[PDB]
């Protein structure tokens, strides 16, 4: 069994009293930053500023704005496996940490006001962590260069705002299956199984 606390998230129902007597209570908290700082950082050539700032910035940003009923933006949510994808892909630090970290927790906002504080606060820690448009072009190269490398990329936003250029260019540039499907209000779990079967050949 597994799940979250009923007192933490609002709208959650409690368990039964008959099933609570035969159910073992196993408490499991999150991992520390010391045990996750040795994995996010390849070697000692990258420095501890990226691993320390990645856990310190995500630990404060994830706690300052969670997806519960106490936080503002519920769309912005990260985990321990989300830092490995941004830390493992960012082997060369310097200016790729802000562009690679701006589409992780700062790209989960609604407008530019929620991404300005997260992007500015998350990108302002890189200058203090190490002693030493641009937003569209900085994410366009990383998104287009990381979209062809693999991974589940999601393009949220308005319809026809610019989410068809990445899918059309990425789907037209590379050789895929081309499984286009138009979801509506009656799109349940049977739409994927019903639309995925007799597509390619089968005649």
């Amino acid at each position: 069994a597994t799940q979250n606390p009923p007192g933490i998230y609002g709208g959650r129902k409690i368990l039964s009293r008959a099933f609570r007597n035969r159910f073992l209570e196993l408490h499991f908290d999150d991992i520390p930053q010391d045990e996750l700082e040795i994995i996010l950082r390849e070697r000692c050539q990258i420095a501890p500023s990226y691993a320390k700032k990645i856990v310190e910035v995500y630990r404060q940003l994830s706690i300052e704005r969670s997806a519960s009923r106490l936080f503002e933006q519920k769309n912005s949510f990260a985990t321990l496996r989300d830092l490995f994808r941004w830390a493992l892909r960012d082997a060369v630090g310097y200016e790729q940490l802000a562009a690679s970290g701006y589409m992780l927790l700062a790209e989960r906002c609604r407008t530019p006001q929620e991404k300005v504080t997260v992007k500015k606060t998350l990108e302002k820690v890189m200058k203090v962590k190490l002693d030493m448009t641009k937003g569209m072009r900085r994410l366009s190269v990383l998104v287009s260069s990381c979209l062809k490398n693999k991974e589940p990329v999601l393009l949220v936003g308005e319809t026809g705002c610019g989410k068809t250029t990445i899918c059309q260019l990425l789907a037209q540039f590379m050789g895929r299956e081309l499984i286009t499907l138009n979801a509506h209000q009656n799109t349940e779990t049977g739409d994927i199984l019903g639309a995925q079967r007799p597509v390619r050949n089968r005649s």
Partner: protein, 196 residues
């Protein structure tokens, strides 16, 4: 898996996508060819598609576990100085290029006013500006035809988006000082005379 309106669906559809990348299975068993035989395992099943947010009218909010596993692209709507002008300049350049400045200035202000929570045609975006700017490409050669047609073309959804133009009833502490069409129709006289 290309999905257009995957965030506009109700309950169901996120259970398979949320377990196909995390668990590595197709839900709690396949519907076609299930029973007590082989299980549905996913070793090379990827997912690439876009969609809308959960704050839209008619759209449902996704889970934090399903949104935290995938990369969220930070791309909202276009601006009203380069996106609305460049996206509305195509097709309206053959007719009048001077009438495409006041059409994108009153379409971005009203779009942030008329929500989609009221009616089904109350929601605006690129479809209203593109349809209103592309549907007014053929008019008169004078300023009266272009101004009247352009000022009466966007109202078809502006004044028709509301539930009622005016209401009169005996309420307790509720008095209507103004209408709901006067505020959206009072900017046409200033916008039609300011630009033109």
């Amino acid at each position: 898996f290309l999905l257009d309106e995957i965030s506009l669906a109700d309950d169901s559809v996120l259970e398979r996508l949320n377990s196909v990348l995390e668990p590595e299975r197709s839900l709690l068993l396949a519907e076609q060819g299930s029973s007590d035989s082989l299980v549905t395992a996913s070793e090379n099943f990827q997912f690439f598609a876009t969609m809308n947010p959960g704050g839209d009218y008619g759209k449902k909010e996704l889970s934090p576990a399903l949104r935290n596993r995938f990369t969220e692209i930070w791309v909202p709507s276009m601006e009203d100085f380069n996106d609305v002008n460049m996206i509305v300049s195509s097709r309206l350049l053959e007719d009048l290029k001077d009438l495409a400045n006041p059409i994108v200035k009153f379409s971005e202000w009203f779009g942030k006013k008329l929500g989609g929570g009221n009616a089904t045609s109350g929601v605006i975006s690129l479809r209203d500006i593109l349809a209103w700017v592309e549907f007014i490409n053929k008019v008169f050669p004078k300023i009266q035809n272009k101004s009247t047609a352009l000022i009466q073309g966007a109202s078809m959804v502006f004044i028709d988006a509301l539930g009622t133009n005016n209401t009169a009833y005996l309420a307790e502490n509720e008095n209507d000082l103004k209408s709901l069409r006067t505020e959206c129709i009072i900017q046409l006289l200033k916008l039609c005379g300011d630009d033109l």
